[PDB]
Amino acid sequence: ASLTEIEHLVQSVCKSYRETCQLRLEDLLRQRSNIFSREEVTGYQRKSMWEMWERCAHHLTEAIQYVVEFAKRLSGFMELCQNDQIVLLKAGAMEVVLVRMCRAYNADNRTVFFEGKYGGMELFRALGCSELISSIFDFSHSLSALHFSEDEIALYTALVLINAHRPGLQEKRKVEQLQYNLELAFHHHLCKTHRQSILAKLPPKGKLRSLCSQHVERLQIFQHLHPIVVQAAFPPLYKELFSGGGEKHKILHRLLQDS
């Protein structure tokens, strides 16, 4: 790689992210005053556990679909073989979503934008997975302290996805080369903007790994309690990525062949 090749990669990654960021940051910032009232919070707590699980799985599935589009527009991703594209998305799409979520998190009052308004952890009490919920809020709180720019989220989420250590990669050297160029693009941009200090403050990879692991652990607990709800009302892509065995569906393959 070269310098001009890396500067071109920065603008390419940022462009691919702007086209797929799902929610406008300005919209999220303007809605900070719009907070769920105590009566609305009580309504969410009164909903059944299985209805809250269905709505959250639907919101995650929608967010993951924008991450799949981010990957398809990400330089070098479609050059990889279809096995490696699927391995990288199965392992990283949820992680990219968890990072993108800090844009919807307000560290001032410890609330998150959810279904039109901002609400705290107590909004999600009906799910019956308080440890997972608090972990999600803590992770978003950690990233808020860094004051990420939009270009920084673009370059960082690209690296979260292009991880040459994921098990099952067939062309490991090809993914290594792509990750190295993206790492250079990230660091070059942090150097050009005098933001290298955040490198030591980025969360360890095990933090994103623990979140995904908790989500699968809590999903299995819920699937045991309401199996027909998962079977009949959860999104098919969600079941393919997270529920055992849900893998037979082949939705990821269709999203990648499309468009």
Ligand SMILES: CC(C)=CCN(C(=O)N(C)[C@H]1CC[C@H](c2ccncc2)CC1)c1cccc(Oc2ccccc2)c1
């Ligand atoms: C449980 C909870 C606190 C919230 C429900 N939900 C959720 O808010 N989302 C998916 C948003 C993720 C961030 C998205 C976005 C995109 C771009 N810019 C800003 C934000 C917008 C959708 C969510 C979060 C994280 C794991 C998750 O998976 C679960 C969790 C519990 C049960 C089932 C699935 C859902």
Ligand code: NA
């Ligand atoms: Na934030």
